[PDB]
Amino acid sequence: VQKKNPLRNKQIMLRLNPYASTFAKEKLGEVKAEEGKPPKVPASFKELLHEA
Amino acid sequence: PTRFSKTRKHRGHVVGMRHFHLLRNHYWRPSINIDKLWSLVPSDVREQYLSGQKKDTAPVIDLLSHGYAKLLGKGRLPEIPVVVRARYVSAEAERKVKEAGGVVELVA
Amino acid sequence: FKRAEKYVKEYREQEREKIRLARIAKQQGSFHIPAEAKLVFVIRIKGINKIPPKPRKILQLLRLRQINNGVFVKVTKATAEMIKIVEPWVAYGYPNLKSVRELIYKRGYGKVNGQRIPLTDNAIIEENLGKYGIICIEDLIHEIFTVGPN
Amino acid sequence: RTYRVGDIVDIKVNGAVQKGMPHKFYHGKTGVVYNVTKSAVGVIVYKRVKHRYIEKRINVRIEHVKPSRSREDFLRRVKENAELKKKAKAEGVPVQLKRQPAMPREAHTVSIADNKPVTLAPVAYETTI
Amino acid sequence: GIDLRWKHVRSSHRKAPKSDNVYLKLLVKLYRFLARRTEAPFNKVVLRRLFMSRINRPPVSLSRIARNLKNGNEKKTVVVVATVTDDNRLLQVPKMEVAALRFTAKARARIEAAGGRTLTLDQLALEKPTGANTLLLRGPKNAREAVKHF
RNA sequence: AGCGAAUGAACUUUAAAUAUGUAAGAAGCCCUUGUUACUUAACUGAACGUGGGCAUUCGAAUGUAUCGACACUAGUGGGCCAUUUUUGGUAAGCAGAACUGGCGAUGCGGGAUGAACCGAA
RNA sequence: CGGGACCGAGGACCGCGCUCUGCAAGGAUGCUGGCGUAAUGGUCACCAGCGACCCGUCUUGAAACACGGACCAAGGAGUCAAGGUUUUGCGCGAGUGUUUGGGUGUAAAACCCGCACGCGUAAUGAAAGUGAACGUAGGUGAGAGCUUCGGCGCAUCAUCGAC
């Protein structure tokens, strides 16, 4: 009798998708990047970027 | 009826030769085909004839009494001898009557 | 539940894979050319007045009959040429996962027996697409976003 | 070339005789032969008037008529569809029988070591000098 | 505004008879119930032929029934939604079970004399509610002076 | 584009934009058999039939409340304006066609105002 | 995580579900105040803001021009008959039509009766005239429905035959 927005009503979200509660609890929208020291940009990329 | 008309709804929105002195009685000659020939027999006698309860008698039909002058040969006839009294007849109608076992007699 | 978990993991891995490939090419001194987009969302933003018969027919075939109507299109040359012809009436581009899930969750209506039925249950998607393996709205979103066989 | 009734032909009026052509509409059109003459041929053409097709007939000299290759691709595709379907039934492996539209290109990597890019301006400096 | 090049088409067939026959209305109610509650297409066809007019229901003769009774159809129940008329050119009548809207007096008498039986459509619905072992017949629709003059 | 390919818009290995014709299947594809009153030097092609083989995927995309045949009835069937294409012209205006769109039949918001403008029905 | 506006459609239960004693899950309930009457609401007259050419007819593509309109009451214009044609309902059905007429009557009604006749049941030809089965009233391809699941195949269409 009434279409309810699942993005506003959490119960419709849990009805249509049981994994939404697990997503919210485990915070899978806030996953940090993999650890490790990032290697620096090669020089030739920089001379190519700043070449007139 | 006037009340069912559309105007009530539209209220507010508006060779050869010539034959002098022809007499059709000269050319009166009605025709019947042989598949309706048994229909001229009365129904109950027709039923005994078709069932086979009359092995010694044959029916005689007068077409002029029933209102026909020519016997034509559309259809087929059963193997029952029938005497036919007609003013006119066609050759194949006479052939089918003779194959049925009857005879066609000419009357005026 | 398991299928939605798998889909979320696949989205995260494909994003990290694209980033890793770009970084590896940059570190090796080359450029990684990304794959061209497979999904285009098309919105009709101009009215139905004074339109030539060929763009009229293309909009009819793309099911853009009213202004502010949007559709999902798989990118082939046969569809790209049509959208290129009806450029003066549409705005089209490459939608992301958030756009797909927002559109399907908020304005999701299925065509069931010629009727426009809101997607309020997984059941409607199940009896309308279960022969293609799509049993819920997460399968529908995954199929639309990744451009699957169905 | 002796043309026959039912053959599908292309019309190309060769030469620069376009000064006084009565009907330039049928140049480059494709039609069906219904009548054959020693130096003429009868071609059935269809014209589109709004929502319906009207049927026109023209008499074209043989010098402006070439046989068309419209059904060559269809007959050819029928032939290799039959042959690869027989081959697939022989070897017991599925094979594609449907031609597909062009798909978008996938991801790939372009090397720079021997193909250093050239920087271009909106005009060429060699043309400026 | 929405651009609809095509047009939704209203139904082009009868849904109810124009006749004011109360017994025909009862027959329509019975066969509406039968066509709704059974899977047999025979009930739907009989309901549609009950809807039709007289020029769409030409008469069927005893000779036509005797023709269609041949070749393994001797024991089938003949169903004709029309008037069954007598044909006097057919001299002998085979035994037959015919269900019809109405019979002429001569046709009914000749059937009962030959040893067959005549039924109404409600009797047909009671004996064969699924249309089992039935031979459905129509008469010559184009055998009319108007159709000749068309 | 090249002519460190040949040759010289009329050069070409290759190849434009714009719309545009034809074709894209089982209702189809061939093979074989004979006849021919067609045709061919010709049982040779083709047509006519005959039989057989091809359903292992029915042989691009997208859309598909879009079917067909009758019956009866009615108005209009050498109207206006505009974009584009094309043929002519004039001192300047302008005159023919082809397609498309709008109007005559049409309300609404904006062009202060309005048959032909914009948005949108 | 706040702040604001508009809306409350349905009327026992059923279903999807969830954070599972219950619930924000297939559409509003709970508590409280004043009044219980012109207070809400409605009609009429007027003022105020915004909007708004006088109708009909003719013309062409259209406006314009032109014509009619002082006002009110009553009257006032696609009707009937005959003959066709298509469709709808009805009765009978290879037949059908009582009502020219007669009988009868509670008397222009109703009821009853039959010979002829009209149309249909046979066409074609100028006419003389002749006059529709080789076959389960044919063969082939479709075709609703039925089927003992082998097929039978209505109407109708296309085609080749027959009279």
Q: Give the gap in angstroms from C-alpha E88 to the nearest C-alpha of chain B.
A: 7
> Residue C37: which of D104, D109, D110 has the nearest Cβ?
D104
Q: Is the CB of C46 under 7 A from strand F?
A: yes
d(CA C41, CA C36): 15
Burial grade of A6 (CB within 10 A; 0-12, 13-18, 19 or more): buried
User: In 3D, which of C80, C83, C147, C76 has the Cα closest to residue D102?
Assistant: C76
> Chains B vs E: touching, with 3+ CB pairs under 8 Å?
yes
Residue C139: partners with Cβ closer than 8 Å, 6 or more residues away = C3, C125, C129, C133
C4–A18 C-beta distance less than 8 A: yes
> Chains A vs B: touching, with 3+ CB pairs under 8 Å?
no
> Residue D109: which of C32, C36, C77 has the nearest Cβ?
C32
Instruction: Give, as ranges, the nucleotides of chain F with any atom within 7 Å of a protein CB.
Output: 19-25, 28-30, 46, 54-72, 99-102, 119-121
Report the run of H or E that residue D49 belongs to, with start and end. Answer: strand D40-49
Partnered with residue C40 across adjacent β-strands are C73
User: In 3D, which of C52, C45, C43, C37 has the Cα closest to residue C71?
Assistant: C43
CA distances from C139 to C96, C133, C144, E130 (A): 16, 8, 9, 43
CA distances from D15 to D21, D26, D30, E64 (A): 12, 15, 19, 72
Taking CA E29 as the corner, what is the angle to CA E27 and CA E31, rounded to the nearest 5 degrees?
Answer: 70
**Nucleic strand G contacts from chain B, 4-23, CB < 7 Å:** 5, 7, 14-17
Q: Residue C96 half-sphere exposure, CB side, CA atoms within 13 Å?
A: 4
Q: Is the CB of D79 under 7 A from strand F?
A: yes
Å between CA of C64 and C1' of F81: 30
Q: Is the CB of D107 under 7 A from strand F?
A: no
Torsion of CA E140, E142, E144, E149, to 10 degrees: -170
Contact residues on chain A for C121, CB-CB shorter than 8 A: 15-16
Burial grade of B102 (CB within 10 A; 0-12, 13-18, 19 or more): buried
Contact residues on chain A for C29, CB-CB shorter than 8 A: 42, 44-45
- Tokens 């067959």 -> residue: E116
DSSP type of residue C63: T
Q: Which residue of D has its CA nearest to A45?
A: D112
Mutate which of C14, C27, C28 to disrupt the D interface (most D C-beta within 10 Å)? C28
Q: Which residue is nearest to nucleotide F71 (CA to C1')?
A: E150
Cα C124 from chain centroid?
Answer: 20
Q: Give the gap in angstroms from C-alpha C92 to the nearest C-alpha of chain A.
A: 25
CA distances from E105 to B15, E84, E102, E143 (A): 48, 10, 9, 23
Cα D35 from chain centroid?
Answer: 25
**Nucleic strand G contacts from chain E, 40-69, CB < 7 Å:** 40-42, 45, 53-56, 59, 64, 67-68
> Chains E vs A: touching, with 3+ CB pairs under 8 Å?
no
Q: Give the gap in angstroms from C-alpha A38 to the nearest C-alpha of chain D.
A: 21
Q: What is the stated resolution of the deposited model, in angstroms? A: 2.9
d(CA C70, CA C92): 9
Residue B89: partners with Cβ closer than 8 Å, 6 or more residues away = B70, B71, B104, B106
User: In 3D, which of E135, E145, E146, E120 has the Cα closest to residue E31?
Assistant: E120
Report the run of H or E that residue B21 belongs to, with start and end. Answer: none
Å between CA of E23 and C1' of G78: 41
E8 in C contact zone (CB under 8 Å): no
C45 in D contact zone (CB under 8 Å): no
**Nucleic strand G contacts from chain E, 5-34, CB < 7 Å:** 17-21, 24
Contact residues on chain A for C16, CB-CB shorter than 8 A: 34
**Coarse DSSP helix, strand, coil percentages of chain C, rounded to the nearest 5 percent:** 55, 20, 30
Residue D111: partners with Cβ closer than 8 Å, 6 or more residues away = C30
Report the run of H or E that residue B6 belongs to, with start and end. Answer: helix B6-9
- Tokens 């190309």 -> residue: D12
Six token digits for residue A39? 């290697």
DSSP type of residue B78: -
Q: How many separate helices (H) and strands (E) can be counted in chain E?
A: 6, 5
DSSP type of residue B101: T
Q: Which nucleotide is nearest to C71 (CA to C1')?
A: F62
d(CA D46, CA D52): 10
Q: Which amino acid is at B14?
A: V
CA distances from E43 to C115, D26, E56 (A): 28, 58, 18
Phi, psi of D56, rounded to the nearest 5 degrees: -120, 155
Phi, psi of E124, rounded to the nearest 5 degrees: -65, -40
D101–C78 C-beta distance less than 8 A: yes
CA distances from D79 to D73, D95, D101 (A): 10, 15, 21
A31–C1 C-beta distance less than 8 A: no
Å between CA of D124 and C1' of G110: 117
Q: Give the gap in angstroms from C-alpha D21 to the nearest C-alpha of chain C.
A: 30
Contact residues on chain C for E4, CB-CB shorter than 8 A: 65
B 40-99: CB under 8 A from E: 47, 50, 75, 78
d(CA E83, CA E120): 11
